[PDB]
Design a binder for this molecule. Structure first.
Ligand SMILES: Nc1ncnc2c1ncn2[C@@H]1O[C@H](COP(=O)(O)OP(=O)(O)OP(=O)(O)O)[C@@H](O)[C@H]1O
Ligand SMILES: Nc1ncnc2c1ncn2[C@@H]1O[C@H](COP(=O)(O)OP(=O)(O)OP(=O)(O)O)[C@@H](O)[C@H]1O
Ligand SMILES: [Mg+2]
Ligand SMILES: [Mg+2]
Lengths: 263, 281, 278
């Protein structure tokens, strides 16, 4: 089952990290991802992302099964970029497409970059409750409170967008089961037949997911959620000693790449 | 028959939040009967229903139903005939309706099972009239309806293509009294036509009225498999196992407590009335 | 009268007909009112109108006053703190990531201090008999468990008006009795008002008032012993009569005549015992 955007309960140390510190670490790692220019810098960001994923405590098989389809999509996009752009040595040059050493290098780099963006986003969303993510997002946008900007609305919209993907897969499962019960066969024929069977589902999936996303806000409003101002917290939101773990993780990483970048 | 041998199901087996939905089920439901699946909330009735039509595969054990053998390693391939023969009405009708209109949704089922457009339309109209849905609602969206209307749409879609096994996860929830009685009589008449009906219910009066056999669950364990009379013989056993008694039996107990003993043990309202008249005679 | 709906029209969305048409009724303060009617009469529409989630078609001729404040655009939040509604679908009630978080959401919105919130959420979760599921995802629950969580989330804040939109439909009889007793006890202790939209006539027979709704119109309104004797009216509109009245009618058609003043199980039992004594 897909685990991106979906909160998986756990007890390891990354679950006790502050959601604000976790969000800052995620955004900082995403920023550092674009600062990788050398092969060794990409490798360093690779070990750091893999350590971040291992800190989640989920089994590697579970994480892989949760991130598989989007990993395959990233692989497809990287292969497309490898074919479209070429340079330096040429291997095959078969028809209008071509395969090049520079193209392969940049395809690998784009795959690594997008993959670890996905991994850090998934680690953030799995270990943090969606409303905790919204609270951390609103806290981060506190300076944006200047110029009379409704930061709470933006944070709630961001949380809804983050929850959109899990709602997409939940609705996919729901309609797949509903159609299976009444005789649909998504496991018959070749790829053409399966695509034909799954193509009438696309509009219902997105419409139902949007309806669920809006129903979440309806449920919040019905129970008195004027906004994030003036509320109390069931869960304590305070800095702690464990919050120094991301900082060093955000520090050491930086140091490495400063001594590891191409420049 | 529908046979379960040592059927266990575990929700998220590898996760730390592992929960055993069903634990070593062993029973044999007879074809052509009315079976009432009873139990407390969270006892595993919906998991059992989803196991009937192979929506969930068992973690362990074997299921034999409608010429099909479902094992932990069965898979979703080649299961269209099983669901041709076995139909399931979900506990929530929202998780069942997906089509643009009520008519299209109801006749989705017949279309998949070899009904021509004329036959599918006639069956859909007949079963929409049978479930007491207004004629003008057949071209409206299934989601622009009330909860009971959605329940009626789901029931009509389930019963449209004539399955030989009808599994109903609380189909009477959300239905008004007249609609509730009409649905119960519709299911009984369907069973009288040569079909098997399995019914998850929280109303013991329905069990005493329509059920031929009773299947009682508790925490995923099958605690009793007997007729309604034998299930409702003892009230201490019923209370001990999170279960209740028909209101007719409760009223008979109240009458006996006040000093008016009744012959036998009434379980249905006409039976209780006959017993009261016999006692007063 | 805690709630006052007066000349209320609602057409959904477009729809050709109004869900409610010229609806007017009053809810007595600190009472139990059972809103009953066939499927398709605007009971959930009434519930969502009282909250403020829906607005009447015409605003300057329809009135909705909840505990003295006229419901509107500028007083919706002053009303939502008075009205807590358990929805017909429990999935539409859940906000938090666990059962305790969902129960505590409404206490967070009311600025209840966390030391009190801990006790209130624990007591509410234990009250609906879900203490073993406090850390569970509310979507990974059975229908009755989801109903219990939805009821607990509303009974924790103890609003002046509790609306229950068929909140006992998917509960086992033990759970039905337990949660009905819990709601009654909370109502009596806190001097609250309960509107129970239900299809169970046994629960409606025990209410203080019964509102009868037909095609979005108030067909009848009164006490249970003034409504349920009208067998023809109830059967004509898709309703029925509770257990005791049906038993009385079968006894009458079987030759045993009983006084019409009998409206409860105990009264019927005593009357039958007296008949047997002779
Ligand atoms: N998706 C799920 N993931 C994990 N546990 C689940 C899930 N669905 C149900 N459960 C749990 O499995 C058990 C059985 O649930 P099930 O839905 O079979 O109950 P039920 O008998 O249908 O109950 P109800 O009468 O409330 O509908 C319960 O403890 C429930 O919390
Ligand atoms: N989302 C919607 N869009 C359009 N019409 C709707 C919608 N929901 C309900 N209706 C219609 O409005 C009317 C009132 O239905 P409502 O849901 O208020 O009744 P109810 O008594 O709560 O339902 P039930 O007893 O069947 O659960 C019905 O005619 C129904 O079809
Ligand atoms: Mg269930
Ligand atoms: Mg409704």
């Amino acid at each position: 089952k897909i685990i991106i955007g979906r909160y998986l309960p756990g007890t390891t140390f990354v679950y006790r990290v502050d959601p604000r510190a976790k969000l800052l670490t995620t955004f900082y790692f995403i920023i550092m991802i674009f600062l990788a220019n050398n092969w060794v810098s990409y490798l360093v960001i690779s070990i750091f992302g893999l350590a971040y994923v291992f800190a989640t405590g989920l089994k590697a098989r579970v994480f892989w099964d949760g991130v598989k389809p989007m990993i395959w999509m990233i692989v497809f996009t990287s292969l497309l970029q490898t074919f479209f752009m070429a340079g330096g040595k040429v291997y095959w040059h078969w028809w209008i497409f071509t395969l090049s050493s520079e193209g392969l290098i940049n395809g690998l780099y784009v795959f690594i970059r997008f993959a670890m963006i996905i991994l850090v986003s998934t680690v953030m969303t799995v270990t943090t409750k969606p409303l905790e993510i919204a609270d951390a997002m609103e806290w981060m946008l506190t300076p944006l409170k200047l110029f009379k900007v409704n930061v709470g609305m933006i944070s709630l919209v961001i949380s809804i967008a983050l929850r959109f993907v899990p709602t997409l897969f939940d609705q996919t499962v729901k309609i797949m089961n509903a159609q299976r019960s009444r005789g649909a066969d998504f496991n018959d024929g070749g790829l053409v037949k399966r695509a034909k069977s799954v193509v009438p589902m696309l509009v219902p999936l997105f419409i139902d997911s949007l309806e669920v996303a809006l129903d979440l806000s309806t449920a919040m409003e019905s129970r008195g959620y004027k906004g994030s101002e003036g509320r109390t917290r069931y869960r304590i939101l305070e800095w702690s000693k464990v919050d120094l773990i991301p900082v060093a993780y955000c520090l050491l990483l930086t140091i490495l790449m400063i001594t590891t970048r191409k420049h | 028959a529908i046979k379960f041998e040592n059927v266990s199901y575990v929700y998220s087996p590898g996760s730390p939040l592992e929960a055993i939905g069903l634990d070593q089920l062993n029973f044999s439901l007879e074809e052509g009967k009315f079976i009432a699946l009873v139990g407390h909330t969270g006892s595993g009735k919906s998991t059992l229903m989803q196991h009937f039509n192979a929506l969930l595969k068992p973690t362990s054990g074997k299921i034999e139903i409608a010429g099909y053998t479902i094992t932990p390693e069965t898979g979703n391939k080649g299961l269209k005939d099983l669901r041709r023969k076995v139909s399931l009405a979900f506990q929530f009708s929202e998780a069942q309706l997906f089509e643009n209109t009520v008519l299209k949704d109801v006749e989705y089922g017949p279309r998949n099972f070899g009904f021509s457009e004329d036959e599918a339309r006639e069956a859909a109209l007949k079963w929409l009239k049978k479930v007491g849905l207004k004629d003008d609602l057949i071209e409206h969206s299934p989601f622009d309806l009330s909860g009971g209307q959605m329940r009626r749409v789901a029931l009509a879609g389930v019963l449209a293509y004539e399955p030989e096994i009808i599994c109903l996860d609380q189909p009477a929830a959300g239905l008004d009294p007249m609609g509730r009685l009409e649905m119960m009589q519709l299911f009984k008449d369907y069973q009288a036509a040569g079909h098997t009906v399995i019914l998850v219910t929280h109303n013991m009066d329905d069990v005493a009225d329509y059920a031929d056999d009773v299947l009682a669950l508790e925490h995923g364990r099958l605690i009793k498999h007997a007729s309604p009379k034998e299930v409702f013989k003892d009230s201490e056993w019923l209370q001990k196992h999170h279960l209740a008694e028909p209101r007719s039996a409760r009223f008979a107990a109240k009458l006996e407590a006040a000093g008016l003993k009744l012959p036998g043990q009434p379980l249905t309202m006409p039976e209780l009335a006959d017993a009261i008249k016999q006692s007063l005679k | 009268s805690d709630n006052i709906i007066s000349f209320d029209h609602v057409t959904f969305t477009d729809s050709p007909r109004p869900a409610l048409s010229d609806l007017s009724f009053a809810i007595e303060r600190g009472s139990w009112t059972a809103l009953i009617g066939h499927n398709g009469s605007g009971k959930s529409t009434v519930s969502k109108l009282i909250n403020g989630l829906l607005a009447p078609d015409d605003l300057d001729k329809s009135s909705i006053t909840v505990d003295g404040v006229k419901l509107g655009a500028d007083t919706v939040w002053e009303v939502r703190e008075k009205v807590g509604i358990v929805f017909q679908n429990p999935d539409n009630q859940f906000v938090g990531a666990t059962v305790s978080d969902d129960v505590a959401f409404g206490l967070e919105n009311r600025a209840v201090p966390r030391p009190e919130m801990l006790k209130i959420v624990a007591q509410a979760v234990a009250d609906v008999g879900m203490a073993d599921y406090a850390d569970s995802e509310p979507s990974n629950l059975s229908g009755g468990q989801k109903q219990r969580v939805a009821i607990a989330g509303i009974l924790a804040v103890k609003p002046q008006v509790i609306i229950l939109d068929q909140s006992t439909s998917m509960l086992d009889p033990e759970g039905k009795e337990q949660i009905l007793d819990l709601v009654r006890k909370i109502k009596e202790d806190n001097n609250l008002t309960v509107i129970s939209i239900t299809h169970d006539l046994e629960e409606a027979a025990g209410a203080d008032q019964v509102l009868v709704l037909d095609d979005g119109q108030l067909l009848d309104q009164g006490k249970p012993e003034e409504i349920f004797p009208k067998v023809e009216m109830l059967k004509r509109i898709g309703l029925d009569i509770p257990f005791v009245y049906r038993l009385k009618q079968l006894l009458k058609e079987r030759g045993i005549v009983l006084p019409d003043e009998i409206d409860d199980d105990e009264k019927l039992v005593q009357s039958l015992w007296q008949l047997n004594s002779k």
